[PDB]
From a paper:
Transcription initiation is a major control point of gene expression. The initiation process is best understood in the bacterial system where the conserved ∼400 kD catalytic core of the RNA polymerase (RNAP or E, subunit composition α2ββ′ω) combines with the promoter-specificity factor σA to form the holoenzyme (EσA), which locates promoter DNA and unwinds 12–14 base pairs (bps) of the DNA duplex to yield the transcription-competent open promoter complex (RPo). Here, we determine crystal structures of Taq EσA bound to an us-fork promoter fragment, as well as a complete RPo, refined using diffraction data extending to 4.00 and 4.14 Å-resolution, respectively, allowing visualization of key features that stabilize the upstream edge of the transcription bubble. The results also reveal functionally relevant holoenzyme interactions with duplex DNA just upstream of the −10 element and potential protein/DNA interactions that direct the DNA template strand (t-strand) into the RNAP active site.
The resulting complex (423 kD) was crystallized and diffraction data were collected and analyzed. The structure was determined by molecular replacement, which identified two complexes per asymmetric unit, and refined using data extending to 4 Å-resolution. The solvent content of the crystals was 82% and examination of the crystal packing revealed space for the expected position of additional promoter DNA. The protein/DNA contacts seen in the us-fork complex are essentially identical to the relevant subset of contacts in RPo. Strand opening propagates downstream to +1, but in the upstream direction, the base-paired T−12(nt) interacts with an invariant W-dyad of σ2A (W256/W257, σ70 W433/W434) to maintain the ds/ss (−12/−11) junction at the upstream edge of the transcription bubble. The stabilization of the upstream ds/ss junction involves a previously unseen rearrangement of the W256 side chain. In the presence of the upstream ds/ss junction, the W256 side chain rotates away from W257, filling the space vacated by the flipped-out A−11(nt) and forming a π-stack with the face of T−12(t) otherwise exposed by the absence of A−11(nt). In the us-fork, the −11(t) nucleotide is absent, whereas in RPo, the −11(t) nucleotide is an (atypical) A, being part of the engineered non-complementary transcription bubble.
Author numbering:
A (entry chain D): 1017 to 1238
B (entry chain D): 622 to 791
C (entry chain D): 905 to 960
D (entry chain F): 324 to 438
E (entry chain D): 1356 to 1505
F (entry chain C): 2 to 56, 62 to 1118
G (entry chain D): 2 to 113
H (entry chain E): 2 to 94
Write the structure that this text describes.
Amino acid sequence: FNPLYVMAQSGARGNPQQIRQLCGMRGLMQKPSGETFEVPVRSSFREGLTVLEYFISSHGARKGGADTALRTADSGYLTRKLVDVAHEIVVREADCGTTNYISVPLFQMDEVTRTLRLRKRSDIESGLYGRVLAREVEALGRRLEEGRYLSLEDVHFLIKAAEAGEVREVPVRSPLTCQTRYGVCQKCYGYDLSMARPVSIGEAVGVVAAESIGEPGTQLTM
Amino acid sequence: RVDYSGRSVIVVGPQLKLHQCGLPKRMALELFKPFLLKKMEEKAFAPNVKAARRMLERQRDIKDEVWDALEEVIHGKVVLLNRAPTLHRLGIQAFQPVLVEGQSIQLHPLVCEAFNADFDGDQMAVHVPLSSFAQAEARIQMLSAHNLLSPASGEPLAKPSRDIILGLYY
Amino acid sequence: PQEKNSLKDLVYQAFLRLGMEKTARLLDALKYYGFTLSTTSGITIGIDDAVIPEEK
Amino acid sequence: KIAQEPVSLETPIGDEKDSFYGDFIPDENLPSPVEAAAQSLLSEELEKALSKLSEREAMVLKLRKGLIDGREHTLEEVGAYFGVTRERIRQIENKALRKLKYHESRTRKLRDFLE
Amino acid sequence: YRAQGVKLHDKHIEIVVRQMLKYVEVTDPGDSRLLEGQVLEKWDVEALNERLIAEGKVPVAWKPLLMGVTKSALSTKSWLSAASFQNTTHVLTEAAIAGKKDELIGLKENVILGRLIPAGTGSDFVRFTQVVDQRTLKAIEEARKEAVEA
Amino acid sequence: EIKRFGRIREVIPLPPLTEIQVESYKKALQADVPPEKRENVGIQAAFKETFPIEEGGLVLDFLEYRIGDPPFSQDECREKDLTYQAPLYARLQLIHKDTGLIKEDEVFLGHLPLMTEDGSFIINGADRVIVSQIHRSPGVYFTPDPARPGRYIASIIPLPKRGPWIDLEVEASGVVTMKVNKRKFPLVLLLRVLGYDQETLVRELSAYGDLVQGLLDEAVLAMRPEEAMVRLFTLLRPGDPPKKDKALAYLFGLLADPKRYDLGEAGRYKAEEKLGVGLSGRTLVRFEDGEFKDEVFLPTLRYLFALTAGVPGHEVDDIDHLGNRRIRTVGELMADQFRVGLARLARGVRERMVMGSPDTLTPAKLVNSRPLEAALREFFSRSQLSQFKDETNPLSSLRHKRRISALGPGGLTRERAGFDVRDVHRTHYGRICPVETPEGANIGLITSLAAYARVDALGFIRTPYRRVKNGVVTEEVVYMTASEEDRYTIAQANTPLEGDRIATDRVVARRRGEPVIVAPEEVEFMDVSPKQVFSLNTNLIPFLEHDDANRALMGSNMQTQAVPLIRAQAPVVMTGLEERVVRDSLAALYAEEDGEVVKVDGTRIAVRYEDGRLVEHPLRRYARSNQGTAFDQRPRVRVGQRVKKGDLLADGPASEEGFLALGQNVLVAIMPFDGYNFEDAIVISEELLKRDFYTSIHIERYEIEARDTKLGPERITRDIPHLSEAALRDLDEEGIVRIGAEVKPGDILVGRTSFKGEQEPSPEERLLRSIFGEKARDVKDTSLRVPPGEGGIVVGRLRLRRGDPGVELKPGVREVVRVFVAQKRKLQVGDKLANRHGNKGVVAKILPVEDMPHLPDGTPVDVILNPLGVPSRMNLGQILETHLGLAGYFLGQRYISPVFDGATEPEIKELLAEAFNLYFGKRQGEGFGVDKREKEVLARAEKLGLVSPGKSPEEQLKELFDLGKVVLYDGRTGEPFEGPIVVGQMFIMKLYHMVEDKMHARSTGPYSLITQQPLGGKAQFGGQRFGEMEVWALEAYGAAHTLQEMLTIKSDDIEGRNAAYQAIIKGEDVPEPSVPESFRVLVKELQALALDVQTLDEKDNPVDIFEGLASK
Amino acid sequence: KKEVRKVRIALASPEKIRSWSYGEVEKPETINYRTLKPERDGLFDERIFGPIKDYECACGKYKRQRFEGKVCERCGVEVTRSIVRRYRMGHIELATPAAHIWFVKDVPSKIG
Amino acid sequence: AEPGIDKLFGMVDSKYRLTVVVAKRAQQLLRHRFKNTVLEPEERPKMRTLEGLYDDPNAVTWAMKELLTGRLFFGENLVPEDRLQKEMERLYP
Ligand SMILES: [Mg+2]
Ligand SMILES: [Zn+2]
Ligand SMILES: [Zn+2]
């Protein structure tokens, strides 16, 4: 029932490393050259840090800060670029009339780790959710229809079937294969992720895409 | 840069609902001024538009009449709230004028995560759509209450946060 | 016990099944209740609330 | 005072790279929406406050004001157009003025625009 | 993105990528007016080849040309788009030299123009939608039968 | 009662904190120093380097220079809006070589600004400060090639404007090339006139083998000095024909010239002690007997080629090392620009000689003021290093003065700064504060000087270290530079001492910033105090050891933004540096000698000193600052008590009894409250507004200018044509507002009438004019009316009219009228509050005293901060401040807890135990037991195990109390909070940002002339900028008409916004716009580029957006 | 009157430039040092670019909306809105022809 | 908020169609001063005011409830535009 642990577990506030710095050792530090220091900082914040520890940790710290700032700049950069390239992409036709598609694999392969492994659920959702089935799918004694919009439940079912090993590939209509002129069309695109239903015509998905990729642009350090 | 616009530092909205924000009184008076001129034209007190405008400009005589009239033009209409930097489309969301004392704009706690807003002195902007067409666009597809799931992810954006999680977990 | 992921799947399931308005209501309800209960809990942070393992 | 030079409109303001000197200059040459609306309401309200007069005196007034061709028709000109003497025109306009004094003393619609 | 812990759907990235490789380099122009190595859009050469097959002529062979998002957007049909982006001088020069006509298909050129944006409610699909009520509908419903009698 | 903690006792006091600016500008002036005995450095260095000049057969010369007395004092210059400056008179003797004519004659120079006692100047009636600059020290250095991984490139370099950069780089042919001013040429070709040939370059030169042959070119070695002089003059300066004398003069001015090329004295010394050689002057080469002789190039090529061989003793220099970096202080900069202007003046003199009458000319006719005047004017007004002083509080100006910037002219800029100059080097330790720095694109660039850090004559920052001999510490404190520190091994200030000598066998030490555990036998030095490792603001954070670096940074930066309060109080727990902060800030009045107070009142504190003299100290009361924060001095002394020397008389805005008072001490409860504290928002008890806590005074000043326009003269008068009686009330005589009058937004501060441009009234207009019969009169009303959102009371009154003494007003302008307006600002919803630990916040709704989480004695808390802000930002210092604040509130004493020598957990716990004994003891002394609700909370705390089971409620409440947590009752219910909640005294700060200033909205205002866009900012009554990203947002939504209104009607479209405002006024729906009107500007601009812009139609036909306008 | 669905950009011939031109600016002044009126042939000249005041000519002979489009006989100022000074373009006839620096300096130089 | 928004979404394929519909309907209502309404006195969206409970002046809301009823017909090329507006003014002064 401790406040720190509770805020951590519930997802209210704080991460294991912050709690690590607030309870256990603050860890090992990195000198400006980039090679890690030979001696640790021992005591946590609540124990208090000696002058030296604080100094080295300040090297690392300000390094981090400069990183974040330059990174917001570059985020604005990339965002504007993407917006400029994808702006013309808009839902126009309900059906562009193409038989072309892409097959999304449910299994990746860790190299030198040999055996094919089932892709983590979030990735599979990231490629399958909202998608329209290119062609018929047969798994687990049930069938999935042509031109069906896959819901979350449908994706989880396809995962269950992938574990069941009847499907290693998911045929799906994609913007990539879409024949729509100066943009993409409905079924080739998918659900409108905000409303969890088939995308409304006239939706400009290029700008939406550009922003969608753009916002995360400020969170990449590690 | 645009006419019919403003900005202020932000304050949490705990009593307020999702489709609402706390748009302050003075800011609203200046923002909606033409509408207020017409509503003062219809509702007695001054003969015409000019009398209303001259009334409002000199001598801040503001009286319950003009405030209730302000809430007469306000009702049902929504305004757009903006937080810089604008990354998502969710960086701009529709909310309602609610006349409140104090110079700070009140914002809903759930949509903060969408604007990437904390109150350290962060500031937000207010724009008012004029035409009934634009108003329709604002209340229908641009409304905060109507936008929940993240268009980027497909997982719901407007979300319980901090204290809320703490209590439900609790 | 309810937490971020659980509450999230709750909200999404509610959106997918019930509807938009019902979910807005649900959200604000969880807001009011969550806040009031957070107040009632009296959850606070002292210096000894960051307890050290004796093994350190 | 003559010797001094003009200032470059592009002269930087503050340490900011986003601002010039010239774009801080307002336009007084161009009527503001409030001003156009003000002139509109003035012309309209004056038009309605004019209509309660006799036809002739109103016509005379708007001949004097420039409400017709924009120019200013004196005395004799008005007398020449309506076929009467100029003095009569004078008395006519004075009378008009005072009648407007009454009705405006009532409605208070035109009591503004007094700046 | 997944390494960082940020989850986003593949659709967006796919759209951007399709915009990246959208260009083609011409090899053996065949019977067309094209020249070797001339760069143009996918759908354009596709259509041209369709018509050429229908016309009983030799189609145009080509190769997939993928470029960075910057140059991809820089090579776009709309000159206002490329002008507003960056490298304004080069664009404008090539543009005016060729005397290219912007058809205002994209949204941001219309944004420059201050014209109703081709997307959203301004989409040509939903913007011509008409709205009537029963009584007015019946009035104008009589309007059609009184025209033939006059 | 005030309690001190920690065992570390600083043997040396903090040196004067304003000393960098004051002393540096002192050395560059030498005012009291006689013109005879002066130091030849700074301004006199400029004089001696610009003189004598000879070029008929005139010979000038200098003699002395004289500082004038200021024509106006500080205050006068400030309220006249004139730079504070004094005339500088150079005494300069003119001679004739051939004639023998001596006309000595004094002369003028210009006006030189004087630095005040605080260390800031005044330019144009505005207090400004010149920040210290950081660049790399002069000398020569060696770094590995960016292009070639296998070798080391060489670099030679002097002071800026003192001559060009030099690079010795081996190109990969095997041949060598030199680069100065962007160009290429072999070294031998330069060895040239320096008296070297094939043999002299192969003689010693090879310990090498392979490295000798890449140097030699026989074609160049064949030709001898003046020929290859012509050659290098042909290469390096292609513009003029390759003359021999031109080559001689030019390349003499490039290198051998002591004036034109000045290599730093520090660079002279360092380069002399690096290459293993010695140097006569500061010049790269010497011009002697008509031939050039080598100084620099030979030993630096020696060291270059040696290091590249791999021979021991030679190594690559560290670029970011502070031993290779120096500080430009204010005096050196001022003298630099001074000598530039002096050079321009030299050229003026040189132009004026060759005309007129070369026989008789006084130096008065030969010399002009403007070159130096405009040079200094340009440096003080324009230059980036010169910026607006921070007057928000005393500590603001103090830190602003101690600030070190890498930016500015001669330095670096935002773009070329990577992780190189932004990072923290090993040697930043006792010199540059590792934490304090802006949280912006400027991180790592602009930093602050450390507390004990000092800048010597050579510009090298040095820091105090106590020498220790065989475990025994010496009272001798040595100031050591970066390299000097690098040589020795230094212990730590917290190392255990047993009465002046070392105790432990394992001592914490360092060799060149590398932590090492080592014995007392080999330690030659020790830190004076941990305080020297941080800046001033950082040193004001108690328990800094428990706070993360980021939030510490934020803490200091926010301490800078501090606004003074009326009741403002010094923190309960302090680090002890606050006193010296208020002292060296010079915002407080002290006793200069021993004496007695003979009077007080709020104007003059008079003291009769022991020396017999009666000296009164005038008190500044409510003086407007730069940011508007009031500067006030409240005397604390009784009449008739004898003061010591240096003793306090009157406080400052930010001072309490000689202690720094930034914010106030309030009672904080850490807990969630109804989601009002959500996201670091701050609930506040309304009680603060009752006690006038966090109430600040802000004076804003407005000015107005009566001119003579060609139309007619402007005039300040009470008479205004259409003005009603009631609006003219406080205007008493000349049309100026009286003193002590409340001014509402829209009210007239001062009246003014300017003749309108003569034009007709419109037909309708003149119809109106006739109807009311009110004479259309002449002049129109220009009067100054206080801007919206602003208002207050009138204190100050100033009128400067021309034709009157003491004031010279610019041409065309009759009189300027200026009014001080002071405002009383209580804490409002939306205002900003923060602590010393870097916890930001906005005021989110205030709460009535009725419902508050209170104590069993009925004492309500003053804030209710949110705990959720704590674990992410990782600042635990505020927690400790809250605990000690609780103990301090109860036992009624304050604390001093220095940085890194602090109070500890057991100490604080003990104080909590004592305070609890007093508190609960007083509870039972008043005849009360333990409340039932408390038994409930104690029970549920026992189940979760916050208290030991089996112990009585007294002992459990005791165990809970020292934890900082007490029982709290909800003022709304009366029921206790389920869990215990930490409460106590926290030091919290009202900052600069307020809703009062930052709330603005606009409907229809002024528009720009070029394009019809509305103006920016609040001051201009501007509209909000809608960015491209926001356009992308609207497009993403798919709102077409919203985006349309944004792009047309509501922004710049003339007919659109007009017809729209018309429609809303008449109650319609706004029409569809047409032309954005900025787009038409775009079209015609494109046409100005001779590009035909055709706007076509559905069928490829011209559509003219200019309607009957440009058609022709 | 008609919709604008298309915008093109091309090279403006000298003839087109002269067609746009309401006159040549001969004299390199701006305004008189005192009267602050546009100089005779100067850059700000009303005789070509149009009047500073709506419908009011320079001399002040034709004063009203009544007269429209008629050139005044002294100043040569067209009676019309004062807004035309934003649109109407002038020109400078060059003695010896010169090149537009764009088609020269552009990365793939066009004339080159 | 705007109740029935889910059903409103269900009424049309693309949302922007709905937005266009509500916009134009609110336009008609503002034009004719709420006399072209298909609503009934009980269904009229009443704004609460101390002076009295009046008709909500907001046309958007009116259009929302109006389309929520279903008495409204919408579509492309439904009726000639000219005759539409013509008799639209013919019915209501
Ligand atoms: Mg913030
Ligand atoms: Zn498709
Ligand atoms: Zn004329």
